[PDB]
Structure formats: C-alpha cells, structure tokens
C-alpha cells in the first residue's frame with residue numbers, strides 16, 4: 001500500500017495552532033515551512049511525476065480583525081489552483097522513496113505569471129495537496145493526498161506577529 005506522510009508535522013502544527021500565513025508577491029515567494037513528504041510503497045522500478053496544488057479550503061475572503069482571522073460573509077466559488085511539477089519529475093519510485101520529497105522551489109504569487117509560480121487569491125485559506133502520477137507505464141494512475149496540518153492563508157504581509165516570530169525562529 002502506497003503510504004504518504006508529512007515530514008516535520010511537529011513544526012507545521014505549531015504554525016497551524018496560530019493560523020498559518022504564506023506570503024504571496026507579484027514575482028512569487030517560496031514557502032516556509034517547505035512541504036516535505038515521506039512516500040513508501042511505490043514500485044522502485046515504476047516511473048512517477050509529483051504534482052502540488054492548493055485547494056481553497058472554503059469559499060470566503062478572510063481579514064485579521066482585532067487580532068483574529070474572520071471570514072467575510074460573501075462566498076464566491078474558488079477555481080482550483082494551477083499545478084506545480086516537482087522539478088525532479090519524472091523519476092523512478094526508488095528516487096522518490098530515498099529521501100523526503102521537498103517542494104522548496106515552488107513560488108506563490110498573487111498575479112497570473114510567466115511560468116513556475118502558482119497564483120493564489122490573497123486572503124483565501126488553502127490546503128496543500130499532492131498528486132502522484134504513475135507515467136510511461138500503459139496504465140496511467142493518480143494517487144492524491146491532502147495535508148490539513150499545512151493549511152494557510154495567503155497574505156501580502158504577515159498579520160499575526162506570532163507567525164512572523166515562528167517563521168524567523170525556525171528558518
């Protein structure tokens with residue numbers, strides 16, 4: 001059985017219990033913490049591409065009011081985010097299972113942009129999600145996995161200084 005697990009859940013949970021925030025810029029900003037995933041149960045000899053996308057966790061705009069994150073009242077449908085291909089893709093199962101799969105080079109933006117960067121809507125709450133796509137074989141296969149522990153609100157600057165302080169302490 002294909003097993004997908006979050007590396008450093010300990011750290012992610014400190015961020016989550018404060019409400020995590022991720023900066024988005026016109027040019028694209030890398031994530032901290034970085035999503036790193038432990039994968040076992042692949043065919044070491046099969047081929048796999050690793051994809052990352054961001055699910056809108058709810059349909060609302062959030063705002064930091066009197067030191068607390070609060071949803072707007074006016075939901076709008078959230079079109080799914082674009083997919084980021086792990087730059088090591090494609091590679092053999094053995095490659096993916098030899099060390100944590102680390103999405104250190106994904107950049108989050110607030111503007112439709114050339115390539116690489118993933119455009120998110122500022123002040124929306126997102127749940128990272130990967131897809132493991134078996135490629136080259138005759139039978140194409142997709143396994144998806146969500147990471148609740150890694151939820152964040154996309155922000156153009158940090159609102160909760162407790163987050164600013166954790167980001168610096170652990171970077």
Ligand SMILES: CC(=O)Nc1cccc(NC(N)=O)c1
Pocket residue numbers: 049050051083085089090133135
């Ligand atoms: C929509 C999309 O990009 N999907 C996808 C699927 C398998 C492989 C790749 N590319 C690759 N370089 O591994 C991309």
